[PDB]
Structure formats: C-alpha cells, structure tokens
Design a protein around this ligand. Sequence first.
Ligand SMILES: C[C@@H](Nc1ncnc2[nH]ccc12)[C@@H]1CCOC1
Length: 164
Amino acid sequence: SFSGYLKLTDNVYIKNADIVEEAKKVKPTVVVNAANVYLKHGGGVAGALNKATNNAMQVESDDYIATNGPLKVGGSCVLSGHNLAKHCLHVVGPNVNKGEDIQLLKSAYENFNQHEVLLAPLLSAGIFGADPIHSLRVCVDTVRTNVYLAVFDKNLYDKLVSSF
Ligand SMILES: C[C@@H](Nc1ncnc2[nH]ccc12)[C@@H]1CCOC1
C-alpha cells in the first residue's frame, strides 16, 4: 500500500512526505517514532504523531514509563499505533544536541530488524541534531528488513537523493 517511493537499495525506499500523513493514508503494521528515553512526545516526529492520536500515545507512554522506567539511548519499545498503525515502534536515536554518542545510531537502527516492514523517519536527524546524510547511510548499512522512509523537508529530501 506504499506509493510514490523512490527505491534506494534492495530493502530501503524514500519519499518526501510527512510521516503522520503517510501513516493516516497507509495504516501500516508498524510506524516508527523518533522517541526520547522518557517517551515525552513534545516536538518533531514524536510531537506530530502524538497530536494525531489526540494525546492517546502520550497517555499510554506515561503508563509504560511508570511501570518500566526509561528506555536506553539506542533502545526501543513496541506500543499501540492507535489510529495511525497497528503498532508504534518507539526508537531512541542519540540526540547530538544533548552530547549523546553518535555511535549509538547504528544500535538504534538495529531495532528495525525485528519487524518485516516499517514506515519510519531518519533517526537522530531534524531536532536531534545529527547529519541526515550520515543517518541515511547508517540506515542503509544496518537495516535488512523493508523500510519506507518519510522525509518531511523537501530541500533535505532532494539533497539526500542527489548525494546517495
Ligand atoms: C527528522 C525529520 N522529521 C520529520 N520527518 C518526517 N515526518 C515528520 N513529521 C514531523 C517531523 C518529521 C526531519 C525534519 C524535516 O524533515 C527531516
């Protein structure tokens, strides 16, 4: 049901799109959230996905943290996808603006290998402060399952494709 994606490799595809609008159209099995360790969905992809769930994602996430404590940087958890997907895979990439080790980006992408197909953003890019060209290269060299990347910024999408 994914449409309009450019094929980059055997298993990685990319499109200039808002991941929230893509999830509402496709209703995939798994949508990836660019989470932080506390699952506090304030801005970027996380704030946008949470708003589309009418804050149900944040209520579920607060119950998960009250029970389990915070995630690790590089880690993940599977929660409901609410009205957007069957499941949401909350993945924590390193936030370079907070001094987190960029080597953890490969560990973050390894979480995608537990799922046959995913709709996802570029981890650690945008407000997380890492170089998006590096994030796409780590994605391609780490993920083996089928990943559909939605990149919101038009200008960054064009740069990612033309430098691939
Ligand atoms: C990390 C990434 N943020 C998003 N990529 C996809 N869907 C999104 N929806 C809300 C944010 C968002 C970068 C910021 C703009 O494009 C690249």
